[PDB]
Amino acid sequence: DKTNLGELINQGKSLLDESVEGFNVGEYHKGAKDGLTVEINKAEEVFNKEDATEEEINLAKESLEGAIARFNSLLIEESTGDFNGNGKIDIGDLAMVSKNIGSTTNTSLDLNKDGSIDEYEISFINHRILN
Amino acid sequence: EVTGSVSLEALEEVQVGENLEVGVGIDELVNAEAFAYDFTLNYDENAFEYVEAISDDGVFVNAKKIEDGKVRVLVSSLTGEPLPAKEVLAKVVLRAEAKAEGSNLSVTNSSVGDGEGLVHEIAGTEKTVNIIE
Numbered sequence: 001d002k003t004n005l006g007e008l009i010n011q012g013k014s015l016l017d018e019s020v021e022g023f024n025v026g027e028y029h030k031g032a033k034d035g036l037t038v039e040i041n042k043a044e045e046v047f048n049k050e051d052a053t054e055e056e057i058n059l060a061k062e063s064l065e066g067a068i069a070r071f072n073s074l075l076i077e078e079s080t081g082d083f084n085g086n087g088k089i090d091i092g093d094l095a096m097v098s099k100n101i102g103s104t105t106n107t108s109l110d111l112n113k114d115g116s117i118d119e120y121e122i123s124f125i126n127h128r129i130l131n
Numbered sequence: 132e133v134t135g136s137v138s139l140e141a142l143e144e145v146q147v148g149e150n151l152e153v154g155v156g157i158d159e160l161v162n163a164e165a166f167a168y169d170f171t172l173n174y175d176e177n178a179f180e181y182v183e184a185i186s187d188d189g190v191f192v193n194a195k196k197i198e199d200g201k202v203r204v205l206v207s208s209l210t211g212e213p214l215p216a217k218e219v220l221a222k223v224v225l226r227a228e229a230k231a232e233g234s235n236l237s238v239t240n241s242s243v244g245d246g247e248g249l250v251h252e253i254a255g256t257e258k259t260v261n262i263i264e
């Protein structure tokens with residue numbers, strides 16, 4: 001039985017259909033759509049016929065559900081990049097990214113969730129402040 | 132108690148059709164370190180047009196025109212170290228369009244952020260420039 005796996009695949013494709021990457025509120029961080037696509041394809045492979053065992057199907061559902069969660073976590077919100085959490089995005093927030101450039105331990109400052117703080121975060125904060 | 136002041140350098144005289152690079156930095160910052168810097172450059176749009184903002188590779192710069200004669204600039208360190216004082220951090224490139232005497236260049240609305248994300252105001256500065264034919 002692959003009904004639920006197929007349902008999750010269709011949820012993922014719908015997220016792709018409806019989403020755009022960019023720097024603005026309601027958009028997703030660069031790479032979000034590529035990442036979700038890789039995971040949908042993994043799930044699609046298991047979905048496609050043959051002798052997939054119920055455990056293979058279950059692992060695939062689990063991984064794709066995690067991928068959907070990760071995609072949603074990459075949604076840019078009003079407060080994204082307001083780090084000290086003082087209600088606005090300003091030069092203090094840009095300074096926090098700068099001080100922490102190269103950090104692999106600051107997993108609230110890692111906006112695109114790629115594992116480190118670099119020019120992406122700098123570029124994002126500059127864009128939000130000025131626009 | 133944090134105090135500080137902007138630095139501003141440019142040629143004292145340029146001719147119509149020549150670029151004026153206006154170099155902005157931090158003259159002094161007391162009781163804080165700055166990893167990012169937010170300032171506004173004011174100029175006379177009757178004398179100059181705004182072209183772009185540039186920087187050397189230890190610093191990231193983005194700027195946006197607010198209105199004629201007013202450009203907001205953001206500077207941040209790429210080095211893992213604070214922005215240094217007594218160095219040009221960003222240059223705002225203006226282009227001379229018309230003759231002018233004692234045309235004012237001023238930096239206002241200037242503040243810095245520290246490593247912990249705290250913001251501090253710093254004092255602006257001004258100088259004049261002549262545009263000749």
Ligand SMILES: [Ca+2]
Pocket residue numbers: 081082083084085086087088089090092093
């Ligand atoms: Ca903030």
Ligand SMILES: [Ca+2]
Pocket residue numbers: 110111112113114115116117118120121
């Ligand atoms: Ca990152």
Ligand SMILES: [Cl-]
Pocket residue numbers: 169170171203204239240241242
């Ligand atoms: Cl400003």
